[PDB]
Paper text:
The HIV type 1 (HIV-1) envelope glycoprotein (Env) is the sole antigen on the surface of the virion and has evolved several tactics for evading the adaptive immune system, chief among which is extensive surface glycosylation (1–3). Env has one of the highest densities of N-linked glycosylation sites known, with glycans accounting for ∼1/2 the mass of the molecule. We chose BG505 SOSIP.664 as a model system to demonstrate our approach because it is the first and most widely studied of the soluble prefusion stabilized Envs. The RM20A3 Fab was included because it improves orientation bias, and binds to a nonnative epitope at the base of the SOSIP trimer, thus leaving the native glycan shield undisturbed.
The global resolution of this C3-symmetric reconstruction determined by Fourier shell correlation (FSC) is ∼3.1 Å, and the bulk of the protein is at or near this resolution. Approximately 80% of Env residues could be confidently built into this map, while most glycans are ill-defined beyond the core N-acetylglucosamine (NAG), accounting for only ∼15% of the total predicted glycan mass. Glycans located on the poorly resolved flexible loops (N185e, N185h, N398, N406, N411, and N462) could not be identified at all; however, site-specific MS data confirmed they are indeed glycosylated. Of those we could identify, a few were found to be near-uniformly processed (>75% complex), for example the glycans at N611 and N618 on gp41, and it should be possible to confirm this by the presence of a core fucose residue. However, we were unable to identify clear density for fucose at any of these sites. Together, these observations show that the glycan shield is highly dynamic with respect to the protein core but exhibits some differences in ordering between glycans, and that it is not possible to distinguish between the different types of glycans from a single cryo-EM map when the glycans are not stabilized by antibodies. To make direct comparisons with the experimental data, we built and relaxed glycan stems into the 1.5-SD Gaussian filtered BG505_293F map and could identify clear density at 21/28 glycosylation sites per monomer, two fewer than from the simulated map (N398 and N426). In the BG505_293F map, the N262 glycan was the most ordered due to stabilizing contacts with the gp120 core, and these interactions may not have been accurately captured by the simulation given the restricted protein dynamics.
Author numbering:
A (entry chain H): 1 to 52, 52A, 53 to 82, 82A, 82B, 82C, 83 to 100, 100A, ...
B (entry chain A): 35 to 57, 66 to 141, 150 to 185, 187 to 309, 312 to 323, 323A, 324 to 396, 412 to 458, ...
C (entry chain B), D (entry chain B), E (entry chain B): 519 to 545, 568 to 661
Write the structure that this text describes.
Amino acid sequence: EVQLVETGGGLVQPGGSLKLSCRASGYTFSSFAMSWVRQAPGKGLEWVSLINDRGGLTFYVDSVKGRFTISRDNSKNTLSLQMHSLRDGDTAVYYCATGGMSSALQSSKYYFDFWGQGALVTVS
Amino acid sequence: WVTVYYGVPVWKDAETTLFCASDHNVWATHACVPTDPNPQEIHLENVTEEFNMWKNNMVEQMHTDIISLWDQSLKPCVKLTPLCVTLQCTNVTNNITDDMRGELKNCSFNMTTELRDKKQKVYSLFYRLDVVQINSNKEYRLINCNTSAITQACPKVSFEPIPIHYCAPAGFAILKCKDKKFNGTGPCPSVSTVQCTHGIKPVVSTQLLLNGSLAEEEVMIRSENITNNAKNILVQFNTPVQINCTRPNNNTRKSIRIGPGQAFYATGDIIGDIRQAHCNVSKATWNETLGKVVKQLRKHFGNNTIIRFANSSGGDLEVTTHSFNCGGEFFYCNTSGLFNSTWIDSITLPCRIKQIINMWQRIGQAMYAPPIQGVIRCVSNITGLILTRDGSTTETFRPGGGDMRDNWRSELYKYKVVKIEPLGVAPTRCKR
Amino acid sequence: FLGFLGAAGSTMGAASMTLTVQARNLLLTVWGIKQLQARVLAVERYLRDQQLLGIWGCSGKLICCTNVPWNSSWSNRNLSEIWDNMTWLQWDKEISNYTQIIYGLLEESQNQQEKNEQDLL
Amino acid sequence: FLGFLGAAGSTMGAASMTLTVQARNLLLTVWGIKQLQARVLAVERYLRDQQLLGIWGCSGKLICCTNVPWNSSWSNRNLSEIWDNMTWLQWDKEISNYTQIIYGLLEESQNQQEKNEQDLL
Amino acid sequence: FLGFLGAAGSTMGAASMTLTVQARNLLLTVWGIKQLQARVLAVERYLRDQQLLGIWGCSGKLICCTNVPWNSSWSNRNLSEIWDNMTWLQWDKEISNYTQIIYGLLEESQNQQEKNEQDLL
Ligand SMILES: *[C@@H]1O[C@H](CO)[C@@H](O[C@@H]2O[C@H](CO)[C@@H](O[C@@H]3O[C@H](CO)[C@@H](O)[C@H](O[C@H]4O[C@H](CO)[C@@H](O)[C@H](O)[C@@H]4O)[C@@H]3O)[C@H](O)[C@H]2NC(C)=O)[C@H](O)[C@H]1NC(C)=O
Ligand SMILES: *[C@@H]1O[C@H](CO)[C@@H](O[C@@H]2O[C@H](CO)[C@@H](O)[C@H](O)[C@H]2NC(C)=O)[C@H](O)[C@H]1NC(C)=O
Ligand SMILES: *[C@@H]1O[C@H](CO)[C@@H](O[C@@H]2O[C@H](CO)[C@@H](O)[C@H](O)[C@H]2NC(C)=O)[C@H](O)[C@H]1NC(C)=O
Ligand SMILES: *[C@@H]1O[C@H](CO)[C@@H](O[C@@H]2O[C@H](CO)[C@@H](O)[C@H](O)[C@H]2NC(C)=O)[C@H](O)[C@H]1NC(C)=O
Ligand SMILES: *[C@@H]1O[C@H](CO)[C@@H](O[C@@H]2O[C@H](CO)[C@@H](O)[C@H](O)[C@H]2NC(C)=O)[C@H](O)[C@H]1NC(C)=O
Ligand SMILES: *[C@@H]1O[C@H](CO)[C@@H](O)[C@H](O)[C@H]1NC(C)=O
Ligand SMILES: *[C@@H]1O[C@H](CO)[C@@H](O)[C@H](O)[C@H]1NC(C)=O
Ligand SMILES: *[C@@H]1O[C@H](CO)[C@@H](O)[C@H](O)[C@H]1NC(C)=O
Ligand SMILES: *[C@@H]1O[C@H](CO)[C@@H](O)[C@H](O)[C@H]1NC(C)=O
Ligand SMILES: *[C@@H]1O[C@H](CO)[C@@H](O)[C@H](O)[C@H]1NC(C)=O
Ligand SMILES: *[C@@H]1O[C@H](CO)[C@@H](O)[C@H](O)[C@H]1NC(C)=O
Ligand SMILES: *[C@@H]1O[C@H](CO)[C@@H](O)[C@H](O)[C@H]1NC(C)=O
Ligand SMILES: *[C@@H]1O[C@H](CO)[C@@H](O)[C@H](O)[C@H]1NC(C)=O
Ligand SMILES: *[C@@H]1O[C@H](CO)[C@@H](O)[C@H](O)[C@H]1NC(C)=O
Ligand SMILES: *[C@@H]1O[C@H](CO)[C@@H](O)[C@H](O)[C@H]1NC(C)=O
Ligand SMILES: *[C@@H]1O[C@H](CO)[C@@H](O)[C@H](O)[C@H]1NC(C)=O
Ligand SMILES: *[C@@H]1O[C@H](CO)[C@@H](O)[C@H](O)[C@H]1NC(C)=O
Ligand SMILES: *[C@@H]1O[C@H](CO)[C@@H](O)[C@H](O)[C@H]1NC(C)=O
Ligand SMILES: *[C@@H]1O[C@H](CO)[C@@H](O)[C@H](O)[C@H]1NC(C)=O
Ligand SMILES: *[C@@H]1O[C@H](CO)[C@@H](O)[C@H](O)[C@H]1NC(C)=O
Ligand SMILES: *[C@@H]1O[C@H](CO)[C@@H](O)[C@H](O)[C@H]1NC(C)=O
Ligand SMILES: *[C@@H]1O[C@H](CO)[C@@H](O)[C@H](O)[C@H]1NC(C)=O
Ligand SMILES: *[C@@H]1O[C@H](CO)[C@@H](O)[C@H](O)[C@H]1NC(C)=O
Ligand SMILES: *[C@@H]1O[C@H](CO)[C@@H](O)[C@H](O)[C@H]1NC(C)=O
Ligand SMILES: *[C@@H]1O[C@H](CO)[C@@H](O)[C@H](O)[C@H]1NC(C)=O
Ligand SMILES: *[C@@H]1O[C@H](CO)[C@@H](O)[C@H](O)[C@H]1NC(C)=O
Ligand SMILES: *[C@@H]1O[C@H](CO)[C@@H](O)[C@H](O)[C@H]1NC(C)=O
Ligand SMILES: *[C@@H]1O[C@H](CO)[C@@H](O)[C@H](O)[C@H]1NC(C)=O
Ligand SMILES: *[C@@H]1O[C@H](CO)[C@@H](O)[C@H](O)[C@H]1NC(C)=O
Ligand SMILES: *[C@@H]1O[C@H](CO)[C@@H](O)[C@H](O)[C@H]1NC(C)=O
Ligand SMILES: *[C@@H]1O[C@H](CO)[C@@H](O)[C@H](O)[C@H]1NC(C)=O
Ligand SMILES: *[C@@H]1O[C@H](CO)[C@@H](O)[C@H](O)[C@H]1NC(C)=O
């Protein structure tokens, strides 16, 4: 049993900023790469960002590439996602998930093993 | 898939040349690297390594290094060729105890002076063991005259067994086994890497091992093959036995010039009376110690076996007695008083002293040990034994020795030399 | 943390973070000669390894990812066993017999790469 | 122009154009031993510097731009003073006490870079 | 196929596929000294060539494509004659007198390249 719990504010003005976070437990945090996936209010899933297990390498979807920052702290078992600028198009549920990458010295994943329940963020 | 790694912690058994390091010596003088005041030791977790003290080439290197240093230290000293002459000898009879009757000879001879035109009549004292009667009942020659040239050790170079540290060259490492109750062979856990060995004192002796290291917990019996009576058994004590040796004779020294810039150091008259050299071993301590040794021998020979100790078998003086160098003089002590028991104040061991010494097992290179003035007193630790098994309900153990490698094997048993092999490959999941 | 060879009993993926620890430890006339021979040898051994990395295209690196595939016949194990259970001493024994094959393949793929890169310029 | 060490009294930015001048100058039995020791040492010193550049990721270069930030506490000066007024001898004295700190940081950033580059492949 | 120097009589373009063959072959006290001198020299010669490749920007390579143009005065021949008819021994004689000029140019273009690459970072 593992848990991923998203926290963070859910209501912002466009043009502002928002920081979300995700507390993990039940597994070695430091052994896994992690990512964020959005669920549009009425559509499907979209990948947004990915961070390596050691925190050194980050990747983004083009639509947030110059706006969002993904960060990790392995001593607290947490992820964070720092949003800036914010658009109406960014309204979504943001899910914390474990998987996405690999560490090249272990079997690859390229899929998401665990999901949290998601933080809801609305841009007004 | 193949990924190359360099700096991989892998090693193989290897033999290399180790160098000496150290903190007027015979051995390590200036041809020796100053030591590191804060040497390192690294414990290796989860490493099991096989050691074999009987195949350890560090022993062969130490044997060779000390012999070569010994010879280099005599090479520049005075040759005593002029001394191999006919001697006219009588007995030293002045205030002699019974134990010393016939031990000292008062010999006169015609010696070379600085000038080639002149000779001098001189005399000196020799021990009975240094001379041979020839023919004229007073005529003698030195013992080495029909065998070898003899040189005089330079009386400025001490024989003190100052400790030597062996250090590995780069690319190599010395592994140390810290497993207590390690018997010299097989695998052991608790292995650490060290830069250098601890200091090892090159103490030369037979039968009894002096001034060495002690076992951490129990007396240990180590042998190449415990059931092979042709092999020696090394015994390491977990406590020292103190031994006190002396030459209670106030000797004087005289210098006889034998040429332009050379002199012979002769024993002159002796002040006071004449007494036998001897060593004292505390009796109770010896008995307790011997107690522990037998308890451990029983583990290999049976606890219903009768273990007997006996004195040495015949052979030369260098083999049958306890030979050691202390105070600058060479003693040959009778250990039959220590090894005379079934199963298990002070014990006095009488000793003989020689001036003409043939080191190790060589023939052809003799040395003369200059006499030491005054009275000699030595205090040392017996830290172990060399035993040989004489062999159906009983076993007899006797003192052994004469092969110096056995005295270093007892200190170097914990060390192994390995070679570092930094490259390796392994599958990874990446592509150039 | 650990000093020289302190990672020897660690697994392959725990080790291989200490590569600089080991790399840096590789650097009377009779005594003079014995020591010069020891020093000259240490240099010669060092240079042979560096030359070898060079011809494989790994000069200047401690970790070099190559373009040669791994034959399953050399060691049919998954990354999990190799990097998480095994130590480097154990691994070295397991594939000792394939070392020369692997080295030959590494040299050859570099020769081909080096030439292709010339033709592209 | 200038030969070996001719730039020693020049400023740091005037010098550092002569790096190949200095780099190329680094290359009876008793006399034989004394000279072999001198030659062996010159080789060993050369190789230690090359090994060190290698672990910092600067192999094969005379000028190597790294990814370590400069702490103002090591030397609180502007580029104008360092490169236009100071000589290398003066600079070496000014930051002598920070040399080992800087070297440790250079080794560590290379270890991290080298691993990140493996994960990306 | 061929071993050491087996390509010596081959043409320049047939040879130059064997570069690793030759590169790998470059690695009583009186006898000890004579042999140490021979070994020390082999190391010193090896390192001078490696240092030289380094300052030209060719470290770690057997074939290094540079940014210096070829003056027709050094050898006015087409690629067909040089690579298909000539051997390396013949070529070495043909351009012996221009070796130092070429080496000076290689060092200088690397110094300029190395600095331009610093300014771009
Ligand atoms: C086992 O270890 C013990 C402990 O180290 C060792 O005994 C020691 O031996 C040395 C040397 O024999 C003793 O030191 C001597 O003490 C006398 C005392 O008057 C001094 O005169 C001696 O100096 C003379 O020799 C020097 C040589 O360089 C000259 O420079 C000097 O001018 C003098 O001529 C010397 O200091 C030391 O006291 C004993 N220690 C004890 C406790 O007796 C023992 O020998 C070791 N066992 C063996 C077999 O070696
Ligand atoms: C050893 O013999 C010598 C003689 O060769 C003894 O020396 C002589 O002793 C007498 C005693 O009255 C003196 O008068 C002589 O002058 C001594 N001779 C010399 C040359 O000095 C010597 O005492 C004997 N030594 C021992 C220990 O007996
Ligand atoms: C040197 O002389 C000694 C003394 O005579 C010789 O050794 C003796 O050899 C006989 C032979 O039967 C033995 O009985 C003696 O016991 C030996 N004496 C000693 C003191 O050992 C010795 O062999 C001679 N050496 C040479 C090379 O001729
Ligand atoms: C060592 O000392 C012992 C006694 O202290 C000597 O033993 C004597 O040896 C002779 C030889 O036949 C025997 O007849 C005596 O009975 C022995 N005495 C005892 C008490 O057993 C021994 O010879 C000495 N050894 C040496 C090498 O001198
Ligand atoms: C005999 O062994 C004892 C015990 O190992 C030695 O005494 C120790 O020497 C060390 C040296 O620093 C001291 O730290 C210990 O405290 C000593 N122990 C005792 C009980 O004093 C002793 O020196 C050895 N004797 C000789 C002659 O070496
Ligand atoms: C024995 O010692 C005494 C002590 O003075 C001395 O007078 C005597 O002459 C000595 N004996 C001999 C034979 O010298
Ligand atoms: C010397 O003492 C020994 C002791 O046995 C004796 O046999 C010998 O004859 C003595 N020599 C002289 C010259 O008195
Ligand atoms: C010394 O030489 C003389 C010469 O005749 C001789 O008579 C004398 O006995 C010799 N001395 C000794 C002690 O041999
Ligand atoms: C030492 O321990 C090993 C461990 O297997 C054993 O085989 C060997 O016989 C022991 N040595 C002796 C002398 O018993
Ligand atoms: C140990 O000695 C006995 C004595 O005969 C011999 O049979 C045995 O083979 C020896 N052990 C080894 C390992 O050689
Ligand atoms: C040995 O013990 C005897 C007993 O009287 C004593 O006289 C002698 O001095 C002791 N020897 C040593 C070296 O302590
Ligand atoms: C050796 O001498 C010391 C000096 O104090 C003494 O305490 C010790 O008991 C002596 N040992 C023997 C065996 O006499
Ligand atoms: C040595 O220990 C044995 C054990 O039985 C004892 O009988 C013997 O008397 C002891 N010897 C001494 C000198 O204490
Ligand atoms: C020796 O003591 C051990 C201790 O357990 C025991 O097992 C063994 O049978 C004993 N041997 C004899 C001969 O009594
Ligand atoms: C050992 O003791 C016996 C007892 O008779 C003796 O004959 C023998 O010579 C002694 N061994 C030595 C080397 O003294
Ligand atoms: C050996 O022990 C016996 C027991 O009485 C004793 O008489 C004999 O003298 C001892 N031997 C030695 C050399 O001390
Ligand atoms: C030896 O004799 C000399 C003569 O003066 C004396 O000074 C010295 O103290 C004596 N040595 C001993 C140990 O008695
Ligand atoms: C040794 O093995 C234990 C077993 O879990 C492991 O935890 C420890 O870290 C290992 N040692 C090293 C240096 O990793
Ligand atoms: C793998 O090795 C086997 C022999 O062990 C060989 O026949 C096979 O062709 C190799 N596979 C590849 C892809 O080279
Ligand atoms: C992969 O790892 C598992 C461990 O769970 C092992 O049982 C399996 O044999 C491995 N696969 C291969 C290629 O052997
Ligand atoms: C390999 O390491 C993993 C790490 O959790 C462990 O669970 C597994 O049992 C290990 N396998 C072996 C064969 O030691
Ligand atoms: C390597 O060769 C030896 C030769 O006997 C063989 O026993 C061993 O199994 C071989 N190793 C492998 C991995 O096949
Ligand atoms: C020496 O200092 C003067 C001062 O301006 C400067 O012009 C000159 O170029 C300096 N020397 C060198 C080698 O630059
Ligand atoms: C700069 O150095 C000081 C100590 O001199 C240290 O406390 C500080 O954290 C360093 N700054 C950085 C960015 O590392
Ligand atoms: C920058 O340079 C000027 C020289 O005009 C100097 O006065 C100033 O102190 C420098 N800044 C720092 C960081 O010291
Ligand atoms: C530093 O160099 C500039 C170059 O023009 C000069 O003006 C300035 O005075 C120099 N500063 C010092 C402190 O020498
Ligand atoms: C370097 O250490 C010495 C030690 O006394 C100190 O005086 C000096 O100022 C230090 N250098 C710097 C730049 O702080
Ligand atoms: C030697 O010359 C002949 C002439 O055609 C050529 O075919 C042959 O291959 C040459 N040798 C080598 C090693 O190429
Ligand atoms: C070619 O070399 C000649 C002299 O041999 C020289 O004058 C000419 O400028 C060189 N050409 C180039 C492009 O450097
Ligand atoms: C080019 O090659 C041809 C060979 O057909 C030769 O005749 C001609 O001279 C070459 N050109 C030059 C630059 O010499
Ligand atoms: C150069 O090689 C070509 C290859 O076909 C050959 O035809 C030509 O004749 C050769 N030229 C010379 C001068 O050897
Ligand atoms: C190289 O110099 C020598 C000197 O005599 C000359 O003969 C030769 O032709 C020169 N080589 C070239 C290619 O010009």
